[PDB]
């Protein structure tokens, strides 16, 4: 099971960890990817998860997009978790660097409520450009299922806990 997490609320937990290493250790039922609408896993959490699957996540994702077209900002799809998890929930939070609406962050977190427990990153944080303190607030006020947040950056983890 999950270990070494700090409890923030009844259902939200947080740890300073690399989500790839956490997924390889725990083999959760669901790992969340910080996806874009095209499922092009180039950088950030998506690039790191895809590299850990030896590009199998990108080959499956390209077939999904060829069949279904792009996701919506704030939407998600469930695909294989490959060697990392049973499933990967690809969730698209708004990318502030591309000018997307930050109000869509709550819609993005609502996708997590379809799964009893998830290993996840903070949506729209990092290279997506939003304030991670805001992302954690929307996560706690939106997600009702059990979420284990992995924050890679130690300095950001300490700021997120100390300002919670
Ligand atoms: C800058 C940074 C570096 C590294 C990490 S990470 O390694 O924890 N995660 C991570 C890295 C890449 C892709 C996606 C990820 F989630 C996060 C951040 C972060 O979000 N900081 C931060 C702090 N205050 C801010 N205010 N407004 C914006 C803003 C951003």
Curated annotation (Swiss-Prot):
Q: What is the recorded name of this protein?
A: Papain-like protease nsp3
Q: Which residues of the full protein are shown?
A: 1027 to 1190 of 7096
Give the bilayer topology: Multi-pass membrane protein
Where does this one sit in the cell? Answer: Host endoplasmic reticulum membrane
Kindly state which reaction or reactions the protein catalyses.
Thiol-dependent hydrolysis of ester, thioester, amide, peptide and isopeptide bonds formed by the C-terminal Gly of ubiquitin (a 76-residue protein attached to proteins as an intracellular targeting signal)
Outcome of mutating residue 29 to A:
In strain: Mu/B.1.621
Where do the coiled-coil regions begin and end? Answer: none
- Give the record's free-text account of how this protein's activity is regulated: Inhibited in vitro by GRL-0617.
